[PDB]
Design a protein around this ligand. Sequence first.
Ligand SMILES: [K+]
Ligand SMILES: [Mg+2]
Ligand SMILES: [Mg+2]
Ligand SMILES: [Mg+2]
Ligand SMILES: [Mg+2]
Ligand SMILES: [Mg+2]
Ligand SMILES: [Mg+2]
Ligand SMILES: [Mg+2]
Lengths: 136, 119, 48, 176, 80
Amino acid sequence: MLLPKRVKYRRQHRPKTTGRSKGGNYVTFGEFGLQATTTSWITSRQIESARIAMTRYMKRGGKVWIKIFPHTPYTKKPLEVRMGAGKGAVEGWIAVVKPGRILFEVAGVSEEVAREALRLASHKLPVKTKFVKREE
Amino acid sequence: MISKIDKNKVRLKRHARVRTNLSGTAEKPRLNVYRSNKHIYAQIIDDNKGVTLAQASSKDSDIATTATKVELATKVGEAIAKKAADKGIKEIVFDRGGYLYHGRVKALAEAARESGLEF
Amino acid sequence: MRVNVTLACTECGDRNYITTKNKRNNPERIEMKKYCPRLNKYTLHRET
Amino acid sequence: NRLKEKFNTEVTENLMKKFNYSSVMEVPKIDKIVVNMGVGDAVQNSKVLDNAVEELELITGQKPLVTKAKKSIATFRLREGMPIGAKVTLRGERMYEFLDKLISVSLPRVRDFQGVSKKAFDGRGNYTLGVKEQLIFPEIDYDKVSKVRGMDIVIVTTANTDEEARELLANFGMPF
Amino acid sequence: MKQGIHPEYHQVIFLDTTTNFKFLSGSTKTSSEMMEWEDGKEYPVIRLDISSDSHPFYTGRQKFAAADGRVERFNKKFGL
RNA sequence: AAAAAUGG
RNA sequence: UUCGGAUUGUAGUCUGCAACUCGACUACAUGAAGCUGGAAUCGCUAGUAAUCGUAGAUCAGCAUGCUACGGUGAAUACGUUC
RNA sequence: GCGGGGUGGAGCAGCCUGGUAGCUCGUCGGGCUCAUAACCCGAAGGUCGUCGGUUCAAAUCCGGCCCCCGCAACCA
RNA sequence: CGCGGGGUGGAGCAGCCUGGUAGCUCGUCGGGCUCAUAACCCGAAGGUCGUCGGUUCAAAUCCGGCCCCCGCAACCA
RNA sequence: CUGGUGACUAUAGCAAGGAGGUCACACCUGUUCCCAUGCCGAACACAGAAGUUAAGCUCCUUAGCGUCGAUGGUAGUCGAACUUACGUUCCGCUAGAGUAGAACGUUGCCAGG
RNA sequence: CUGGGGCGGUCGCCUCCUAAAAGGUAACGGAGGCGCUCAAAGGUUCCCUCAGAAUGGUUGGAAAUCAUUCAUAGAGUGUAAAGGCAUAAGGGAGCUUGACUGCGAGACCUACAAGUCGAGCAGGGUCGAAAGACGGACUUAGUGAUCCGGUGGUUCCGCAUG
RNA sequence: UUAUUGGAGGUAGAGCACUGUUUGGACGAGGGGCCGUUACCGAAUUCAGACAAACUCCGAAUGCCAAUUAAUU
Ligand SMILES: [K+]
Ligand SMILES: [Mg+2]
Ligand SMILES: [Mg+2]
Ligand SMILES: [Mg+2]
Ligand SMILES: [Mg+2]
Ligand SMILES: [Mg+2]
Ligand SMILES: [Mg+2]
Ligand SMILES: [Mg+2]
């Protein structure tokens, strides 16, 4: 479960989600990558689910990189309370993903294995994705 | 290998600090002083135009002689005062050049005062 | 400083100035030169 | 100025010939000698620092500068500004006199003396010698020494390298 | 130097008594005895037990021979 | 005429 | 500390076949704790306690132990409630 | 929801006011006893709930996580 | 704000009235006591009298300034 | 050309290599004098001219660092039209990053050469 | 006041973000400070430059004090934050009291009452050789109207007149 | 109101130079298990890649303030 060891501010304005991916739009560590095509918050729990799925399929043969990190805390109010009286407590941590960002990368396996692993991973995520290779 | 400081550089840091607050005008030009291990130089500078009006050095043929540095500074002060008076200058502001106002610098300043420059 | 202080001219007695002092740092009646408008000159004023 | 005359006459020529200096201005010389005594127990007893200052003054010939804590350290119970050392800087004739005296009269008085460390060079031509007891110096009578404490003697030289500094000090007569 | 802060300091002759070796240098010892220098003026003399010309480490003099090895001590003790 | 228990 | 003499280095003597484990003694050098000892606890009524040495058995060698010998030589006992 | 507290094995101080961890009982060793208890002498035992912060320095001051206690949780 | 009182060994009280001298009860240390233990008896150490001044040959004591605590009373920016 | 003293967003700086001295600038020699060191004639101050270009300083070379930096494209965005789509379209403006490249300064006044 | 009221919390002032590159701008939005301090920690003149690291050095260790080098600000700026400050606004020393009196063109802010900045003039001073600087503090919190009463001063009035 | 010109300012974007956050390598000042060499390498350094209302080496479009300013109103 990824989360920063600490942050300066625990209560933060929720991030902007319109626009395109600012960076990390290319496969840079591995051979194959999973590229987001829609926008979503991605939670640490979703990251962990997808990571386990792909690594278990790869059977420890290859290497996996998580390219996104859930830096941002988001809060939630306690159950059945009225509006106001301050901001709520930190509920979880999210990474903002916009079209084009590479979520995961893999190396050290065949293209077919990478495709199947990243398919299994993508079904755990709240975004549409596409299999991508290193460009040249 | 202890380093040796550049006395002129230290002096210039001090001089720039002085010159932040001290500048010469056309009506009250700045009397700037430069001092070496042997000689002493004096200029009268209008900073608005950045032009020198009068100059006098202990290295000049008119002043060069065999005297102590303080006596040469006195002579340079008298000479610069005379040249400024000839060019029609009475009020000036004394720029000690970042040197301590003492010894040779003080002798030059007092010589100019006695010769008639009004600080 | 933690207490108010009145400085009065020691020549004419006029209470010309107010200021403040720390009583622990300066337990004595503090004194200083100040301008006395009545006498048109600087005189020694001291805490009353 | 016997040591200074030796430097002017013999050491200059020897060192210049050895290191092939194109000019005499390249010949290293001892710029200064700084004798320091760190008295950390002055925190607990200022009289210790007073005695240390008096002894250092007797050794060197001039009044020492009292050096105070630059910062507070809880473990040492040290507060910023508390006097915890003494220092004397010697230049010129006094420096040379102290140096020859240290080489000749003082160093041999070291108990079980076997020379001074040859590796105690900062790496840039300066040599620090740690004396472990003040009784070494001929100016101190052991009767009046309430406590025995050491000193650091920093010989600051114009040599750019430890090799040139070693040659200079050896020619002066430092054991090694 | 400033006036009145530094201790009294004057030229003395340090005299290594073992080798009767004199050398002139400054110091605040103020010993009473005076011995004439090569220069006419006398200065107070400081008696020295040891010096750079009298210390075994400086001079290289070996006071005592090195310790014998075990074989050599065996042989010299038992006569074989 | 202060207090001083117990022991398959 | 000129107290004390433990520990350690070197050089030896003797007995014994042989002194490393594991003997005694001598010389030179080193020079530890220890400044009269908490709770508690022991011996002794006179030639006793305390103190000083001397000899013997065992034993090639080895005693601060044991068993004997003498020299100097005390204090105290009201008394029997505990 | 608001307060109060968390310190040797137990109970309780120390916090207010930064530099100093105390008491009683318990434990261990020696003593006393035929032996145990009681008793006497001597000792060990707490990184101050756990993480961060300010400070030269934090049981102490400040903010979170945890645990316990008390009070509150009302009108339809 | 007025009037009184109090501050003394490690604790709790005198001595202040009326100038000398630091006393009493507990507490700690040593001794006697006892089979110990307690109780009891005897030796000691323990505050220089809240703090700074002032008058006197002499100050816990007399006279002032100041720091706290208590009692009663006063208080219409 | 050298020096003094100014102006300019380092295109001016840093680093490395190299050259220079009767003028001058220094290092340098001293502590009598004015002055000075919480100690020190190191520094400041003063007096001076035996020695040295070793260092400073000046000059020369460069593109390693720093600095400057387009064009083209992209992000963003004023306005309009359409739209509820984590939007689309058209027009104007137009980065940051990066690329080519610039650059080891340019100049005013005064005194000497 | 209040996402009904009670209960809880809050109420004036300063700094930042929200705040949409002038200014302003709300919520029981997100974070912190203030109700002082300093007789120098103020004025002025002169001088000075940090934190940190590496390497040597005795008691001295990872950090005490000493020395060289590197170190462009990572230090310091009384006190929150922001904006500034290494020509210092940071540090040291000498002398001092401008932490003055009368004021004030003009300007900011602003419903009012208030609040803020201010050249310059006059009087009399401090430091400085002089130019000149100085009407507190690197800047912005550290505060409370009127009525009433107390205290000092006063070439003001004084219920027929003194 | 528009045109032109000048200016104040730090948002969108972007970036990582600072403050924080963060992913993979490389290497390790130096000591420990280890004889020299098969943890920690917690340090530091370094390459590449990311995140920010209260980060900024940068930095728009607009909006704003003006001009002995022109046109229309
Ligand atoms: K999916
Ligand atoms: Mg029975
Ligand atoms: Mg028992
Ligand atoms: Mg509602
Ligand atoms: Mg704004
Ligand atoms: Mg009223
Ligand atoms: Mg009347
Ligand atoms: Mg952005």
